[PDB]
Design a protein around this nucleic acid. Structure first.
Ligand code: K
Ligand code: MG
Ligand code: MG
Ligand code: MG
Ligand code: MG
Ligand code: MG
Ligand code: MG
Ligand code: MG
Ligand code: MG
Ligand code: MG
Ligand code: MG
Ligand code: MG
Lengths: 124, 37, 244, 205, 46, 32, 95, 97
RNA sequence: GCUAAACCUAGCCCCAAACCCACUCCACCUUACUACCAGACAACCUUAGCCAAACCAUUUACCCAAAUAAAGUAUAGGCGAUA
C-alpha cells in the first residue's frame, strides 16, 4: 500500500523519522546535553559582498560590441602570461636557479595556505 | 591419504581435451587408505 | 546475438588490458602455465596403453584426476596436496544399492617446523603425507622450494617459498648477523634454487595481490605543470641563442 | 528547451507554440515524414533568397524566401503558392480571408542568377580569400547571402544603450592582470579581510 | 472474522524489512537488487 | 551488368597469427 | 529406441539385439532356441537337439530387428574363414 | 470488416537489377573451375549452416556445438531447453515406432 | 442511419561483422540517494528433481571449445531403458 515511486522526504514516517531527515541544508553546530543547540560562528558561511559604488559594469552589454573569438584559458597560457616574463628577465641577467622557483610563484605544498587548490577547502 | 577410484569408466577425451564428467563419475570406491599401511 | 570471443576466453582477454598488461612477463607466464598436480587421491595407470583383458586389444588409457576440495583453513597449513574428497558411494559396494553422499577428510596434525633459511619455527597444520614429503626432501626448506605451486596447495607454502627465495636472491645478511660463516654455509646449501630478486618478489602472489602490488609501484603524485613548463621554456631559450 | 518526441512532425507553426501544441499533443504518434538528408554545407537556400517556383500553380514565378524549415527541407516564399483561409472567425463574423503560403520543397524551387533573372544551379566554392560562397554553375557568378533581420529582433545600428547596458568602452576594457592567485585570494586582499587562523588538515575518503 | 486488512502500514517495519540496507545485509538480498536492476525496475527497494 | 570476378582459392600458404586468441589451436602446431 | 541421438543426431542401435541375433546379408536373422541350456536333465534328446539348432526369424521379427539396428550391421562383411559365409546369399529363390 | 477498403500500393519489381541478373552465376564453379572451390563455399549465412542441412533437433545440436560458447546466457538457456524438448518429442512421441 | 469499419508505420526477429559499457556540480550501504567521529562482521563448500525405464529402488543424453569421417563402432548398462 506504500508508494515506492514517490520521493522519500522528511514529511514521511513517525516522529523520530521526521526529525532526523533533512532538506540538504548544511549544519551550523552541534547538540549538547538537554537538546541544546550550540551554533558555531565559524561554521556559518559569511557572504563577502564588495562595494558596488562607482562600478561601471552593468548586467547587460550593448549590442554595439565587436564579436571576439572564444579562447579558453589553459595552464600553458596562464604560465606564459604570468611566469614567462619573470623567468626570461632573470635568464638574460644570468641569475636563474631551480632553488628560487618559489620566487616566480611556484608553491611546492598547499599545506599552510588559507585557500588550498587540492584538496579544495574554500567555497565558490 | 585416502585413495579412491571411479565406479564408472570415463570416456577417453583425446589429445589436449579435458574429460567429460557426468554426475555418475562422482561415485567412488575406496581403494586403500595409506594410514593403515 | 553472439559474442566476438568465447566466454571462457574473457578472463585471458582481461590479462591483456588494464593494469594486468603492465604486470611482469615472468609472473604472467606463471599464471598461464597449468601443470597437472601430482596424483594424491588416485593411482595413475603409469602407462599410455593397456591391453584390455576382455577382447585382448591395446586400448589407450588416461588419468582423470579426482576433484579435490580445499577448505579455506588449508591455506594456513601444509596439507601436502591433500584435501576433502566430495563424492558418492554405493551402500555395501553394490551398484544396485543406494547412492549415498560421502566425504573423506584428511587427518590433520599440528607440528612445529624450523626453517634454516628463515631461521624461525612455524606451527603449521600438516598431514602424515606432508611429513613424508619433507622427509623425502631432507628438510622443510628443500620441500618448500622443490615442491611446485600446484602440488603445495597452500597459500602459506607459497608465501614461505617467496620468503626463502628473497633471502637467497638478496644474500640477505639478517640471517645470523653475528655468524657470517654460518650464513654463507646455508646459502651455499640452497644455491641451486637462487633466482633474480626481481622475479623472486612476485613468486606465490595471487592475481589480486599482484595487481595491488603493481598499482602501488605505479602510484605517484602527478607532476605540477609549472615544473614541466619551466623545462620547455628553458630549452627553447637556449635554442634561440644558437640561431642568433 | 522542450525535449520533443522522437518522431515529432515539424510544421508551419513553430514548435512549442499554442497552435503546435493543439496539432501535436504529447500523446500523438504519427507516421514519420521521409526527408531527404541534406548536409549543412550542401544546403544552399536561406531567408531572403530569390527563387523561382518550378511546380504548382505559381510555376515560373519568382519570390523572396521568408522562412526555411531544415527538418522538412521547406522554403516559404511570400505571396506565392498561396491558398486562401479565413482568419479571426467568430460566431457572428465569418472572418477575413487572407492568402496563406504553402511550404515548398528545396527541389521545387531554384535559385536565380543575379545578372540574369533566370533559375540556375549553384555549387559551393571557396574564393581567393578563403570565404565559402555560392557560385552559379552556368555563369560562374558569386551569389551573395541575402541580408535578413536577426532572429532576436535587435538592430545594432538602431540601438540605444539602456540604464542597465554596459558601454562599449567599459565592456571591452581589459583590467585583468594574470597572476598565480585565486579569485578568493584577490578579494581578501582587495577588501582588506585578514585571517590569521590556519586551516586544519582533514581526512579524505 | 473479516479478512483482507492484513497490511497494517508502518514506516519503521517497512524500512527495516524491505529497505535498501536490509537488502545489502545478505548475499541473497544483493542478488534481489541485481535482478531488479537487470529487469529495469524503477524502484529497487523500499 | 558485369559479373564479379570469380571466387578463387587464394594462392599461397595461410599463416594464422599465433598471438590471436581466436586462432584455432590446430593451425599453430607443427602438423599444420 | 533413440531415433535422434542427443550428441550426433543419428539413430542408435539397441545392443541387446546384437548380443543375441546374427543378421545374414540376405536379410535373414539367426537366433538360438530359448532354454537350450536350462534343465537338460528333464528333456528328451529329441527335444534337446531341436534346442541346439540355429533357427531363422519370421518376417515380423526380422523387420523388427532391422529397425532396432543401424546400417552398419547390414553391410556386407568378408571375414576370413567365416562359418556363416555360405549363408549370406540366397540360391534358387523364386518370388 | 477484416478486409481492406482500398487497393494496396502497386508492387514494383525490378526483374533486371544486379542481384537478379547475376543470380546463379558461379554455381558451377567446381565443374568449370577444375574443382578448386566447391559450390557450397558460396553459401553465406550462419557458420553452423554453410553446406549442411538437418531438422530442428540437428540444427540445435550443431549450433550449440559450434557457437554455443559464444551465445548469450539467455539465448543458450533457451537452446538447451529446446534440445531437451526436441529429444523427448522425437525419441518418445509420435504415431510410428 | 448510428455504433463501427479500413490503413502503414513505429519498431522488432534471425544472421553477418565487430570484443561493449560506466564519472558536470551535489547526494547515495544509517531508514540508500542522509555534508562532518574509535572500525577491526567479511568471499570459497558434489546441484536436486521432474522425467524415461510404461511402477520403482541401480540407472536416464545436457556446449566444453576443428566442420566432416572413423561411428552410433569399441565400450558401458536392474547387459533393461538407454549411455
Ligand atoms: K518417435
Ligand atoms: Mg503498491
Ligand atoms: Mg578426435
Ligand atoms: Mg564437460
Ligand atoms: Mg490484500
Ligand atoms: Mg496489529
Ligand atoms: Mg527492460
Ligand atoms: Mg545512483
Ligand atoms: Mg517412469
Ligand atoms: Mg504410482
Ligand atoms: Mg554388453
Ligand atoms: Mg525391454
Amino acid at each position: 500500500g506504500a508508494d515506492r515511486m514517490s520521493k522519500w522526504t522528511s514529511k514521511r514516517g513517525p516522529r523520530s523519522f521526521r526529525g532526523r531527515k533533512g532538506r540538504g541544508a548544511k549544519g551550523i553546530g552541534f547538540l549538547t546535553s538537554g537538546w541544546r543547540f550550540v551554533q558555531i560562528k565559524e561554521m556559518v558561511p559569511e557572504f563577502v559582498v564588495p562595494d558596488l559604488t562607482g562600478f561601471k559594469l552593468k548586467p547587460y552589454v550593448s549590442y554595439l560590441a565587436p564579436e571576439s573569438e572564444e579562447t579558453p584559458l589553459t595552464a600553458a597560457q596562464l604560465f606564459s602570461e604570468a611566469v614567462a616574463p619573470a623567468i626570461e628577465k632573470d635568464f638574460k641577467d644570468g641569475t636563474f636557479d631551480p632553488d628560487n622557483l618559489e620566487k616566480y610563484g611556484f608553491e611546492p605544498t598547499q599545506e599552510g595556505k588559507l585557500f588550498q587548490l587540492y584538496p579544495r577547502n574554500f567555497l565558490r | 591419504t585416502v585413495i579412491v577410484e571411479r565406479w564408472w569408466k570415463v570416456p577417453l577425451a583425446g589429445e589436449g581435451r579435458k574429460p567429460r564428467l557426468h554426475r555418475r563419475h562422482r561415485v567412488y570406491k575406496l581403494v586403500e587408505d595409506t594410514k593403515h599401511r | 546475438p553472439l559474442h566476438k570471443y568465447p566466454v571462457w576466453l574473457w578472463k585471458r582477454l582481461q590479462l591483456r588490458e588494464g593494469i594486468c598488461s603492465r604486470l611482469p612477463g615472468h609472473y604472467l607466464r606463471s599464471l598461464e602455465e597449468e601443470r597437472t598436480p601430482t596424483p594424491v587421491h588416485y593411482r595413475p595407470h603409469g602407462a599410455k596403453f593397456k591391453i584390455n583383458p576382455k577382447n585382448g586389444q591395446r586400448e589407450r588409457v588416461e588419468d582423470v584426476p579426482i576433484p579435490i576440495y580445499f577448505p579455506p583453513e588449508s591455506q594456513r597449513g601444509l596439507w601436502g596436496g591433500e584435501g576433502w574428497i566430495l563424492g558418492q558411494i554405493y551402500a555395501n559396494n553394490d551398484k544396485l544399492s543406494k547412492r549415498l553422499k560421502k566425504v573423506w577428510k584428511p587427518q590433520l596434525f599440528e607440528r612445529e617446523f624450523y626453517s634454516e633459511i628463515l631461521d624461525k619455527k612455524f606451527t603449521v597444520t600438516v598431514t602424515m603425507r606432508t611429513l613424508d614429503l619433507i622427509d623425502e626432501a631432507y628438510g622443510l626448506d628443500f620441500y618448500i622450494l622443490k615442491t611446485p605451486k600446484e602440488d603445495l596447495c597452500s597459500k602459506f607454502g607459497m608465501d614461505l617459498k617467496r620468503g626463502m627465495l628473497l633471502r637467497l636472491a638478496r644474500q640477505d645478511p639478517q640471517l645470523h648477523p653475528e655468524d657470517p660463516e654460518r650464513r654463507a654455509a646455508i646459502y651455499d646449501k640452497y644455491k641451486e634454487f637462487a633466482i633474480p630478486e626481481e622475479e623472486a618478489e612476485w613468486v606465490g602472489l595471487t592475481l589480486e595481490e599482484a595487481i595491488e602490488k603493481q598499482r602501488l609501484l605505479e602510484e605517484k603524485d602527478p607532476v605540477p605543470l609549472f615544473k614541466i613548463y619551466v623545462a620547455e621554456l628553458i630549452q627553447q631559450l637556449q635554442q634561440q641563442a644558437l640561431s642568433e | 528547451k522542450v525535449t520533443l518526441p522522437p518522431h515529432y512532425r515539424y510544421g508551419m507553426s513553430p514548435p512549442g507554440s499554442v497552435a503546435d501544441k493543439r496539432k501535436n499533443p504529447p500523446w500523438i504518434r504519427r507516421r514519420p515524414v521521409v526527408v531527404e538528408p541534406i548536409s549543412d554545407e550542401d544546403w544552399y537556400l536561406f531567408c531572403g533568397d530569390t527563387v523561382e517556383i518550378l511546380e504548382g500553380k505559381d510555376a515560373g514565378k519568382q519570390g523572396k524566401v521568408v522562412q526555411v524549415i531544415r527538418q522538412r527541407n521547406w522554403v516559404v516564399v511570400g505571396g506565392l503558392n498561396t491558398h486562401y483561409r479565413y482568419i479571426g472567425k467568430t460566431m457572428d463574423y465569418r472572418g477575413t480571408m487572407i492568402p496563406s503560403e504553402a511550404p515548398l520543397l528545396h527541389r521545387q524551387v531554384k535559385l536565380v542568377d543575379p545578372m540574369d533573372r533566370k533559375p540556375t544551379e549553384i555549387e559551393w566554392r571557396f574564393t581567393e580569400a578563403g570565404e565559402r560562397v555560392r557560385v552559379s554553375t552556368r555563369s560562374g557568378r558569386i551569389i551573395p547571402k541575402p541580408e535578413f533581420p536577426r532572429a532576436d529582433g535587435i538592430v545594432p545600428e538602431t540601438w540605444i544603450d539602456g540604464p542597465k547596458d554596459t558601454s562599449v568602452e567599459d565592456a571591452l576594457e581589459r583590467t585583468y592582470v594574470p597572476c598565480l592567485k585565486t579569485l578568493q585570494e584577490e578579494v581578501m586582499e582587495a577588501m582588506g579581510i585578514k585571517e590569521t587562523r590556519k586551516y586544519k588538515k582533514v581526512y579524505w575518503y | 472474522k473479516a479478512r483482507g486488512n492484513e497490511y497494517q502500514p508502518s514506516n519503521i517495519k517497512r524500512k527495516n524489512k524491505h529497505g535498501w540496507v536490509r537488502r545489502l545485509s545478505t548475499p541473497a538480498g544483493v542478488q534481489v537488487i541485481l535482478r531488479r536492476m537487470l529487469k529495469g525496475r524503477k524502484s529497487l527497494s523500499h | 551488368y558485369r559479373a564479379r570476378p570469380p571466387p578463387r582459392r587464394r594462392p599461397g600458404p595461410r599463416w594464422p597469427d599465433p598471438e590471436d586468441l581466436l586462432t584455432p589451436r590446430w593451425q599453430l602446431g607443427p602438423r599444420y | 529406441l533413440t531415433y535422434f541421438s542427443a550428441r550426433k543426431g543419428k539413430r542408435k542401435t539397441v545392443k541387446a539385439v546384437i548380443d543375441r541375433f546374427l543378421r545374414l546379408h540376405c536379410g535373414l536373422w539367426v537366433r538360438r532356441k530359448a532354454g537350450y541350456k536350462k534343465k537338460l536333465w528333464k528333456k528328451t534328446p529329441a527335444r534337446k537337439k531341436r534346442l541346439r539348432e540355429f533357427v531363422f526369424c519370421n518376417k515380423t521379427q526380422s523387420k523388427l530387428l532391422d529397425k532396432m539396428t543401424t546400417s552398419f550391421w547390414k553391410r556386407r562383411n568378408w571375414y576370413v574363414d567365416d562359418p556363416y559365409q555360405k549363408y549370406h546369399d540366397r540360391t534358387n529363390l523364386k518370388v | 470488416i477484416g478486409i481492406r477498403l482500398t487497393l494496396p500500393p502497386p508492387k514494383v519489381v525490378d526483374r533486371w537489377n544486379e542481384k537478379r541478373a547475376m543470380f546463379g552465376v558461379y554455381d558451377n564453379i567446381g565443374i568449370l573451375g577444375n574443382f578448386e572451390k566447391h559450390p557450397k563455399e558460396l553459401i553465406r549465412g550462419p557458420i553452423w549452416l554453410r553446406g549442411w542441412k538437418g531438422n530442428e533437433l540437428q540444427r540445435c545440436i550443431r549450433k550449440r556445438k559450434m557457437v554455443g560458447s559464444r551465445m548469450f546466457a539467455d539465448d543458450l538457456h533457451n537452446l538447451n531447453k529446446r534440445i531437451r524438448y526436441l529429444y523427448k518429442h522425437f525419441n518418445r512421441h509420435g504415431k510410428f515406432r
